[PDB]
Design a protein around this ligand. Structure first.
Ligand SMILES: OCCn1cc(-c2cnc3nnn(Cc4ccc5ncccc5c4)c3n2)cn1
Length: 289
């Protein structure tokens, strides 16, 4: 049972902006639509019935950990952009950690979508998805928000095939454990094959390290969801990058788009493009299609 009286009053006020009453939420706990380390995602209906995704945090039992997670993620309620996942609300109830209510994404995560052989997205399709992500990140960067886990698995596609940058704020979790490793300086599970060289070395994350991750995501898109560096052990990713080595150009990646990827992975963080620059560059590349 989570008591609001025990929680920081400032956090309580913030949360009370987006609270959903239990009687307004129906959750189908027999319908798992995603699985994270903090809890699963379930089909829900919000009430005018709205189809939604309900993210559990029930694996987080410590009040202090729940408090910290809410504190770090609540700013999500302040964001509004077509390429950024929105928050529908938070359901506080009698027993269990708060439920995070999110818009339902009919087409799931971007990586699974492009790996699906029946979909067979074209080069144009894939660059288009990449442009959408760049716009969402441009928005978050303008808000000084550092994502820290950008990757194709962490972007969702809605019913209109609009890409939402996701897995941040209250929606943050590890949804595919295979791509997080403890082989790094922090000893915690991190997406090391998406991380900028300086993040692996200094444990610090910035918008410019998000740009590095975006470069990897672009590579994911153009390979239709191939795993990066399949032949590089998690023990070796830092030295691999230190040696100046990088992901190779995908077969169906246009030369100018691979140039963009390489700029995203410049060893000097300040030498890498802003997301505003990336939107401009990728928009031009897309338009030639
Ligand atoms: O291999 C991992 C596949 N996978 C990625 C996710 C994922 C990646 N980033 C996310 N950001 N928020 N949410 C929760 C969420 C939000 C909306 C959903 N709509 C339909 C189906 C599942 C949904 C899951 C996210 N889920 C779920 N499964």
């Amino acid at each position: 049972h989570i008591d609001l009286s025990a929680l920081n009053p400032e956090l309580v006020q913030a949360v009370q902006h987006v609270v959903i009453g239990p009687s307004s939420l129906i959750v189908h706990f027999n319908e798992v639509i995603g699985r994270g380390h903090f809890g699963c995602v379930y089909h829900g209906t919000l009430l005018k019935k709205i189809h939604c995704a309900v993210k559990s945090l029930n694996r987080i039992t410590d009040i202090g950990e729940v408090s910290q997670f809410l504190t770090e993620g609540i700013i999500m309620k302040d964001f509004s952009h077509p390429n950024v996942l929105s928050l529908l609300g938070i359901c506080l109830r009698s027993e269990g950690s708060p439920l995070v209510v999110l818009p339902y994404m009919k087409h799931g995560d971007l990586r699974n979508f492009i790996r699906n052989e029946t979909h067979n997205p074209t080069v144009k399709d894939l660059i288009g998805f990449g442009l959408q992500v760049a716009k969402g990140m441009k928005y978050l960067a303008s808000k000084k928000f550092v994502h820290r886990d950008l990757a194709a698995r962490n972007c969702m596609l809605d019913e209109k095939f609009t890409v939402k940058v996701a897995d941040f704020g209250l929606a943050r979790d590890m949804y595919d454990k295979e791509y997080y490793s403890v082989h790094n300086k922090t000893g915690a599970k991190l997406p090391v094959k998406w991380m900028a060289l300086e993040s692996l070395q200094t444990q610090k994350f910035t918008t410019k390290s998000d740009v590095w991750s975006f470069g990897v995501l672009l590579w994911e898109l153009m390979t239709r969801g191939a795993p990066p560096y399949p032949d590089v052990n998690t023990f070796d990713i830092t030295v691999y990058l230190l040696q100046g080595r990088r992901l190779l150009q995908p077969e169906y990646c246009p030369d100018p788009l691979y140039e963009v990827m390489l700029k995203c992975w410049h060893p000097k963080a300040e030498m890498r493009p802003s997301f505003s620059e990336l939107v401009s560059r990728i928009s031009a590349i897309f338009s030639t299609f």
